[PDB]
Design a protein around this ligand. Structure first.
Ligand SMILES: N#Cc1c(NCc2ccccc2)ccnc1Cl
Ligand SMILES: N#Cc1c(NCc2ccccc2)ccnc1Cl
Ligand SMILES: [Cl-]
Ligand SMILES: [Cl-]
Lengths: 125, 5, 125, 5
């Protein structure tokens, strides 16, 4: 119907609660391995944020895996920053991490993050 | 909150 | 860190993508039964929106059930409207459904929906 | 979109 009312804060409240489930390890269903580091998460949140995870978890064989190993070139801190962004909308972008964050966002197919990294890099050159 | 979207 | 940047549309985009997964029946992990009707959903989204589902899916026995049966007094249309609200922030509140929506929101422990129903009812009296 | 939160 076109006569709905909308609760402005609903989407951010849902995301805040999903991050609280992640913090408490409630209903996490996959472990992402990035060389020596492991990250627990919810497949649905990963798919809703990343083109790469959407492709992985819609694959008829990979959708059933409980562990996904990322390319060894991926930086664990870069992945950690992007995982936090997925769950909070907040990106901890710093001079010391921007190259790793951009490379990880390109691999994960997160276009809006790639765009802001490119802009911040261009401003410093 | 509530608004007309 | 307190130096993060934030992507304003991220939370609403995540919710839009979770509703697209629900529409395509991708990674739905529970069926909610409301008398003769069945509704497929994601446990994490239900828990992030409803105090009742949070209690159910954090219970050590109920967290493993693939089917949850609601109280026979719950109206399926009222539940359908609230499930759509969980996934879109949009509430299809009408004169013909407000009593069923309010009763369902009270049962599901969705306080913001209960509050707006009470306000709309008070304005019409 | 990006903003300072
Ligand atoms: N989940 C989800 C999702 C989604 N995720 C992000 C993404 C980005 C690029 C390519 C594919 C997917 C995108 C569109 N539609 C859905 Cl349903
Ligand atoms: N998921 C989730 C969730 C959450 N859901 C909604 C809710 C409402 C009332 C009582 C309990 C829960 C609330 C708080 N903190 C988390 Cl992590
Ligand atoms: Cl993005
Ligand atoms: Cl609510």
């Amino acid at each position: 119907a076109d006569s709905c009312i909308q609760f402005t804060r609903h989407a951010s409240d849902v995301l805040l609660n999903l991050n609280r489930l992640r913090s408490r390890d409630i209903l996490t269903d996959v472990v992402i391995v990035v060389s020596r580091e492991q990250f627990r998460a919810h497949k649905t949140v990963l798919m809703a944020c990343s083109g790469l995870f959407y492709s992985i978890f819609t694959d008829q064989l990979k959708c059933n895996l409980s562990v996904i190993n990322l390319d060894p070139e991926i930086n664990p801190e870069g992945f950690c920053i992007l995982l936090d962004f997925m769950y909070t909308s907040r990106l901890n972008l710093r001079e010391g991490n921007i190259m790793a964050v951009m490379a990880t966002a390109m691999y994960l197919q997160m276009e809006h993050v790639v765009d802001t990294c490119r802009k911040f890099i261009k401003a410093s050159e | 909150a509530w608004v007309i979207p």
